[PDB]
Design a binder for this molecule. Structure first.
Ligand SMILES: NCCCc1cnc2c(-c3cccc(Cl)c3Cl)c[nH]c2c1
Length: 503
């Protein structure tokens, strides 16, 4: 449910909430109001509030005195299932026991605060189907709200929109009778499960929130102008839905696989992980790599993976070989900020190296402005005729923190990557990696998915950036990490539409 996240609370408001409405073990998370990528975990212990910083520069959530995580929900899940594991600077244990729930509705897909009654009928008439709903602030009754629902068959009167008035009396919400709820979310959840019935029998089913993020490609410029004037709010609504994505990650947690993960708690989902076959028969667990298949849904596929560790380079090449991948995208330098982000896993130019049962030749490197292309030949040792060329596109100019201030470089790169993949008959998924394999990796993959829709169907197709992101996030944890990456995706799509109108 992720109610412990408070999107619009101050540091002082957070202390007071925990001191007046919480107990020892109560906690909440909140953003830093002028520092995107900064979050705070506020926790009560010993009748006093402690504040722990979480930093995200684009690769992972880094909890001070704790671990690195793919999502705040995964971070809270981990500490609510492990006593004694979160520690103060001096080393005392901080326990997260009791989430302190937020009543703020602003990050709910169905909450459209500023929106009139006829404005809500238009949207539902056009964009909505049976069971589509939204909640808006009342115009005629200050402080109250309205629930607008479409029901019918999918202009002949077969459909209709019903309005239901939501009273706010003494910080509780009701539909005119029955139960009084502490938040609009509690109210909506209750009638989502126990639908209202009109006397004459219509069931006001709340099946899905009204979709307002799906846009036609030719109107990208206007939506971006609107989000610029916010990108923040839309992003936060997306992050709220990450509690629905806590799929199991058991294989990455096995003792045998511990040291195959760059970060112990950033792990591939079981249901999409790449399973490696034909492993050394002596090796107990030989089927594991920290990598997931990303299959775009609603025909190129990807594998999103971490930067190699020295002990997983053999597994990486087993995976490229097994999957028939012919194109690799590397999203970081080898070293950034003096720290190793992905080990060198390819031979020096003109050299040949064996990586366990795999053999790799570096045929030729070519320097471009923003990237290096390495033409590699991959084959299985002892088996001459298994040789294939693998083209490695190494993007070298992404800044150490944040995102590029212009998307042309990335877009020129993806264009060239796309033409290479398309030129090779029956090529397998495009491998995209480095660092933890969720931030830049997920950003490059999302842009690539969106740009391919526009390249095939033109500027007469519909795109939905957050839906696309949620679909990739259901296949690997935390794909697209920051609000800066989120804005960068919109800017890249826009830029790609502006140069297609230049043709
Ligand atoms: N309270 C803001 C209401 C406007 C709104 C609606 N919808 C989304 C979405 C979204 C869209 C499709 C699917 C999913 Cl799962 C999401 Cl989160 C992400 N930001 C949004 C913002």
């Amino acid at each position: 449910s992720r109610r412990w996240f408070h999107p619009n609370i101050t540091g002082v408001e957070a202390e007071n909430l925990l001191l007046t409405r919480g107990v020892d073990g109560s906690f909440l998370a909140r953003p830093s109001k002028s520092n995107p990528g900064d979050f705070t975990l506020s926790v009560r212990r010993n009748g006093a509030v402690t504040h722990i910083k979480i930093q995200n520069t684009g690769d992972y959530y880094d909890l001070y005195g704790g671990e690195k995580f793919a999502t705040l929900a995964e971070l809270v899940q981990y500490y609510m299932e492990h006593h004694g594991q979160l520690k103060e600077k001096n080393g005392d244990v901080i326990e997260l026991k009791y989430p302190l729930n937020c009543a703020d509705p602003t990050s709910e897909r169905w909450f459209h605060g500023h929106l009139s009654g006829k404005e809500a009928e238009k949207l539902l008439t056009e964009k909505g189907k049976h069971g589509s709903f939204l909640v808006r602030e009342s115009q005629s009754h200050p402080g109250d709200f309205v629930l607008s629902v479409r029901t019918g068959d999918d202009n002949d009167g077969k459909s209709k929109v019903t309005h239901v008035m939501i009273r706010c009396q003494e910080l509780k919400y009701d539909v005119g009778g029955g139960e009084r709820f502490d938040s609009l979310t509690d109210l909506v959840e209750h009638y989502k499960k126990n639908p209202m019935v009109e006397t004459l029998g219509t069931v006001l089913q709340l099946k899905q929130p009204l979709n307002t993020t799906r846009i036609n490609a030719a109107e990208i410029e206007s939506r971006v102008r609107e989000l610029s004037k916010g990108f923040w709010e839309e992003f936060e609504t997306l992050q709220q839905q990450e509690c629905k994505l806590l799929y199991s990650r058991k294989e990455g947690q096995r003792q045998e696989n511990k040291n195959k993960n760059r970060y112990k708690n950033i792990l591939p989902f079981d249901h999409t992980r790449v399973v490696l076959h034909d492993g050394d028969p002596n090796e107990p667990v030989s089927d594991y790599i920290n990598a997931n298949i990303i299959m775009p849904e609603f025909k190129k596929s990807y594998i999103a993976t971490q930067g190699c560790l020295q002990n997983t380079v053999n597994d990486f090449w087993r995976m490229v070989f097994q999957e028939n991948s012919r194109v690799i995208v590397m999203t970081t330098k080898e070293v950034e900020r003096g720290k190793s982000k992905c080990v060198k896993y390819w031979p020096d130019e003109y050299a040949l190296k064996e990586y366990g049962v795999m053999r790799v030749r570096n045929v030729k490197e070519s320097a471009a402005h923003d990237y290096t292309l390495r033409e590699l030949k991959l084959s299985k040792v002892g088996q001459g005729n298994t040789e294939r060329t693998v083209w490695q596109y190494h993007f070298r100019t992404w800044p150490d923190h944040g995102v590029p201030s212009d998307p042309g470089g990335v877009l020129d790169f993806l264009e060239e990557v796309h033409h290479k993949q398309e030129s090779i008959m029956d090529a397998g998924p495009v491998v995209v990696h480095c660092s933890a394999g969720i931030g830049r990796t997920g950003t490059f993959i999302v842009i690539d998915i969106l740009i391919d829709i526009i390249r095939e169907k033109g500027v007469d197709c519909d795109i939905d950036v957050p839906k696309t992101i949620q679909m990739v996030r259901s296949q690997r944890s935390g794909m697209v990490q920051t609000e800066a990456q989120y804005r960068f995706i919109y800017m890249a799509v826009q830029h790609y539409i502006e140069t297609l109108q230049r043709r």
